[model samples]
Target: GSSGSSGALFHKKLTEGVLMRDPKFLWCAQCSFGFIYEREQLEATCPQCHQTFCVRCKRQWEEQHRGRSCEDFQNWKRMNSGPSSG
Candidate 1:
């Protein structure tokens, strides 16, 4: 459980820390549009820009994660990517 500054309006150029500092308020990773954050609600659509985002992963919703749980997405990412350091 978290609490944030109540009635704070959305504005551009919010600090990176403020972006996801509270579970109650979250800004879209893509457009920075603020919205009431929900964890269980996986697929969150931005009303301002109409972009889909994953509340769980806290990133833009993608086809790979579509219909897949957050844990599934993480597993998929691990399975598809390999260590690239030389």
Candidate 2:
């Protein structure tokens, strides 16, 4: 499942939090989800977009689309705002 520099970085970030931060703290940015796990690692998925993103990114995304539904989230800013937009 691991490949390329981005993938390596993603895995590394997931395993290890930002430098000067605690390793036990893991987060998904796209949805502002965090976990402190011992045996298993933190896993996250976007509630709206269903995309897998880091803790930081997930948080940012959630902040940007707060109070929006999955459909609204996906079609946000599009002209049609319907299935056609997707």
Candidate 3:
């Protein structure tokens, strides 16, 4: 499978096939910091940014949305903002 660029994606995920380890801290994919999740919090909020974006998908309330897709929100932004938004 490592014969060409087509298999590169698989190689990245396989990365020597070492077992994955669990996270000790609640790292925000959005914030990309060691923002620990304990003590005082309203659930999943980044300490510095105060955002609930998941480190896995970078989306808020991932379980609430269909597939928790960021594209869905981006589509909404495009629809609501018209020419004023990116």
Winning candidate number (lDDT) = 1
Error of 2 at 39 (Å): 22
Candidate 2 has an lDDT of 0.47
- The residue-by-residue lDDT of candidate 2 on 1-82, one tens digit each, is 7766434455445544556756655455534455654334123454555554434323334442555644555566364445
Score each candidate by Cα lDDT. 0.70, 0.47, 0.56
Model 3 residue 24 distance off true place after TM-score fit, in angstroms: 8.2
TM-score attained by model 2: 0.23
10 residues in a row with least lDDT, candidate 3 = 61-70
- Return the TM-score for each candidate structure: 0.47, 0.23, 0.38
Q: Name the regions of candidate 3 deviating beyond 4 angstroms.
A: 1-20, 24-31, 35-43, 54-68, 84-86
Span of 10 residues, lowest total lDDT, candidate 1: 77-86
Compose the digit string of candidate 3's lDDT tens values, residues 1-86. 45643445665465575658643566676457776554443246677877766444445643434453556756665677684663
RMSD list, candidates in order = 12.5, 12.2, 8.2
lDDT, residue 33, model 3? 73
Tell me the deviation in Å of residue 46 in model 3. Answer: 1.0
lDDT of 2 at 45: 53
Clashing pairs in 3: 29-55
